[PDB]
Amino acid sequence: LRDFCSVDGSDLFWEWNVTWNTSNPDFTKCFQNTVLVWVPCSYLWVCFPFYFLYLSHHDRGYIQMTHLNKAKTALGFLLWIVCWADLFYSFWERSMGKLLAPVFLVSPTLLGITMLLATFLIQIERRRGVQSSGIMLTFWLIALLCALAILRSKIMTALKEDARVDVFRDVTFYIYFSLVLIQLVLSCFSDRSPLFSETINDPNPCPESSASFLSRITFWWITGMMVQGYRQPLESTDLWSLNKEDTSEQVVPVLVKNWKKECAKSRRDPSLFKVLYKTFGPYFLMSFLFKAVHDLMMFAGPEILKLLINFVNDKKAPEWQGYFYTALLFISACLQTLVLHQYFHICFVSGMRIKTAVIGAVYRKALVITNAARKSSTVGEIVNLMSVDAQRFMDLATYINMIWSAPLQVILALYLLWLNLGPSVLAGVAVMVLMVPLNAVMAMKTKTYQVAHMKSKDNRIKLMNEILNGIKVLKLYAWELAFKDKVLAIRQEELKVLKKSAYLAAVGTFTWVCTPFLVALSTFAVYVTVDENNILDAQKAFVSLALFNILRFPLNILPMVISSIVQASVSLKRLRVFLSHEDLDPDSIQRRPIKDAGATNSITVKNATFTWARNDPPTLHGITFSVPEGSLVAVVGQVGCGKSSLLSALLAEMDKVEGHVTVKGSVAYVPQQAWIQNISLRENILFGRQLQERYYKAVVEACALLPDLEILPSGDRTEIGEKGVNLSGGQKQRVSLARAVYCDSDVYLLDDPLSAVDAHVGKHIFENVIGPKGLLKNKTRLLVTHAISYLPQMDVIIVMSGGKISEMGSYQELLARDGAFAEFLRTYASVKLSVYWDYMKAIGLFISFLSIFLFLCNHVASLVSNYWLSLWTDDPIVNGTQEHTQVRLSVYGALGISQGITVFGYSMAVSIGGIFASRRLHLDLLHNVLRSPISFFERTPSGNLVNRFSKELDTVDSMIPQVIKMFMGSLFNVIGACIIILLATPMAAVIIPPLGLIYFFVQRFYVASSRQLKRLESVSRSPVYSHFNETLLGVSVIRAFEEQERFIRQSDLKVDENQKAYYPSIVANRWLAVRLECVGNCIVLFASLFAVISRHSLSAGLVGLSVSYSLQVTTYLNWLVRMSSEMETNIVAVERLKEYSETEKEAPWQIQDMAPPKDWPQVGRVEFRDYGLRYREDLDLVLKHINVTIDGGEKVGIVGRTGAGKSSLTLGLFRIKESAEGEIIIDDINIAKIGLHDLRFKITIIPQDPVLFSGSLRMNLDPFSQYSDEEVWTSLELAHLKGFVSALPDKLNHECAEGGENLSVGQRQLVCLARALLRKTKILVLDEATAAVDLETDDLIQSTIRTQFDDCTVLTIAHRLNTIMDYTRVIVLDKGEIQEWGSPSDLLQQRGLFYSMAKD
């Protein structure tokens, strides 16, 4: 090996005297001229073949011949030349006689070949569309570093006066060096974008496909957006456009193809795992490569620390080895950071692609499912496939690799702790084996308690929705406090479960914070006690600690990853069982264009049997009927003959068990269950088509849409709201028919459309759109309908029976032949820093001080424990042994035990404070809302209230405490590392200014932009799920109008808009990570460097402490900025839950100082002193000096035309809104001065709402639970329902469904009647109750009045004048002024407005 570098093999290859053990280090000549030349060449060669395979299988176009790349190839040639120059000189010497070894001829040969390959790679790169190449930049970096070694070597060996350095090879090498420097300087630039670029036209293209290699691996291309986020906000129009590789159009087809292939090779169910692997695996193995490199380099720290400590001990060492070590430490750290975050990028991008592909596949699949499939599940479970499952497949990609990484890191760490610390490391492995059962049990019971929390919060959410709906009823009856207490009890159960979770979380924090210390104590005890000879130097500790600090994470993350793989396995089963469903047959109903003149009837069927399942009783049996072109046919039959199925069959919903059908032309469908999208009514109608003003106006004036818009606020542009804000049944039917009539298709399959419309508007719709002279006069129109008042105007009427077509023919023959239809007719027709203070005050100032104190204790104890381990490592060896071992181990264990006790203390304290604050903020939100006037409920949307009670409160309950823990922990770890550093090597304060204040103000831009981006992401995730719901609901329409491509495209566009926000957030995380990890690596470098500058003073255990802490700052800083961002996002929940604490609340409820007597409703007098109310200040009063002093016991009604205000009469009676003017006095009492409940109780009411609540009917009969079953049944019987009451399973405890759906309409009516009876106050009311209940209930109330309510004054608002006919008096009014009073009969005799209505 020496005959190669020297003729006689003289100049050695590695003489430690020259390279390591000297104050002036320098590689030998053999080394310079073999290995320092074979490193870069070897690199380029090892990366050439695979790089070429890549540039073959990945092109970006072709790049014009620019300048930069010209100069690059020119320098490559000059390098080839100035490298073969050495070879020509070498042969000039060989031939000329001197005996020269192989090296002096083989080195320049390889160098020249590799420079030529550098030129060839530049040209291949240019022809493959690569602007900035990572392989070339790295090759030039390696070459330049090796060349800098060789160049220092030559410069030294030349400056001396003794040796006459060769002028020739030295000149050639100076040349090679300048050229490689310029080539590296030119590898960091970019070329001119390729000339075949197709996405250049996009105004906002992702800045990544055009970014340097340096900007990429440092994610520097998001600095623009992160600074923009600070200077001014980020809306959805600054979000870049997705890379083409991340769009749904270039992601979903590949997964769909692979899935079809797997299924085809199946027809052993298809394994979605194999497909996800075959699709997203190529891009996901690079994650394995980067993670492997990161794992192997995470262990350079501990080893370079072992070397550095051996240095600080060896005080005969040359001062430059400590610098070599500080440099290697810095460089390993920085490579680890870049590699790690490239891996994280790959994983997050692969999860993003998986989610896009899955949402797309699910959506495209729902539109082909056979009806049986969609029945085999619910709509909620088919939308979860998007909402829960795909999110799991997404969030898993980022951790899955730990399955194999965590064991590798733990194994390397154990092997190193062994190689360093002997067979004692079993003492730590034993604690680790006992952390796995605990972590497993805890991760189990955490889910066990989360399930209970969710099942108990869904109940509260349901009750809260019911209350926010029946706000009015509850506010009238005075039932506020009862529902308050019910919801509070459900809350208490939730809180108990959450406290259990708090104990579990406390134990978890104990583990995460005290794993390294427990492991270290076990190891050190077993080591210093199993043998006296064992000495605890600064190298066995402070190298073992590092391995512990980098062992905790694997241990504590492995159980979470296991549980998440399990959850994802369940999700994958669900998703596969969906994507495997049987699909409809596209070719069962064979169609034909509108011009193919084969058959002259738009429809023909031959004995076709149909069914909704594979083996059930076919609903339709042997049909045959051919509807000629344009002929209007109308199928009729008793309910359940097979009517509603002929349409669903022609539309290809059912399964053609046997037969043959064909439909010629474009179809149109108007099913019985109308389907209306969440867009503008006009947008619905046009159904995505070029508006043609004339035809739109026509179709709208046809189906009687004009009288419909007149009420809806904005007109046809009226956004129908949250899935049909206000539209009503007949309205929805008309809108659907408008859609069908606009589409203007050949065959119109009308499925009992006009059913929900009255006879009059119905006949209009027929005559205008369906009739023989309507809009569809020249369309082949079917009609499966009930109303027999049109069949004459028809063309053919078909009737069936139990799925068999009874008889067909014209109405003429239909009547003549006296056939079945004869029977059918004859039968049927027969943050400003105060949010945080508020959260702290809700937790309680004491518990806050306690949490801070216990944190401080934990961390002062940890720090002093480590300074103790240091002072222990510095114990002198006296007589081959270490003194003070007993004392030191005792104190170390004591400090650690105290640390653990304090970590448990503060975790439990912060969690118990979380419980206190959850309880308090919830109670206050509840009380404030329940006190808000009804105005606050009409104005503010129910969405806001439901959101505060669900999500804002979930944040205050189960997210803030954890974030507070992680934030405080990261903050104090950073502060502690900094204390240890500044104390070991005090001349490091000169790094804090230049390194924290100015590169820890990266968090300005991060926090700022990350907030906007998280918002944009969560504001854009619901659209996908709403679309998918709205598509599952109306899939028959979408499938019958041939509008499937449009909807697939809209799903893709929504998924892409969501990704356009999800992608910059991930990259912002990588931005922050690289920046703050660079800061942490600078901390590592500076601590190590100031420990080297000052050896002679520092103590050789202090250095280990300092560097060991420097090696954790790196992760702590990043987690700290992330948790600051989270605290800024989550704390706003405390400002949300406090919104309604200053909103105008209603008047006081109880007034004891002016308390009303027990018999407050003594006389039932009705004094009206020109009172006046107006819904709002801006509007006009609706009571115009209303005046009457009604005596008690009376029985009078209140009637008025539209805009009369009797409704207002009520609203003001109970004081739902304060008195706008005037007065309303009773029994010498100005109700405006009485206590809200002090009056509401004694004034009965039968609100015009049969609204029940989720409870045992007894609850409705008595929410307060202040009524006895005796009088309960007394009412029920008296209430004319006691019979079916006893008919209930639980006589008085028959708990009903939500809203009282288990009771009939008249049922709930009688229910209100009994409510009033039980109340049995002095005075009562019945607001338009006769207009929503048969005469039975109205008359039963009248009988209760003449017999049970005779004593009760009565002012009643009803439209059925007869409902007040026999009443004592009567009054009306308009424009806010009382119209006429006194008896009703005298009114009629007066021929007044009452006489008018009577004429009506």
Ligand SMILES: *[C@@H]1O[C@H](CO)[C@@H](O)[C@H](O)[C@H]1NC(C)=O
């Ligand atoms: C290292 O050792 C050899 C003798 O073993 C000696 O000749 C050589 O000069 C030493 N290296 C240096 C730089 O002195």
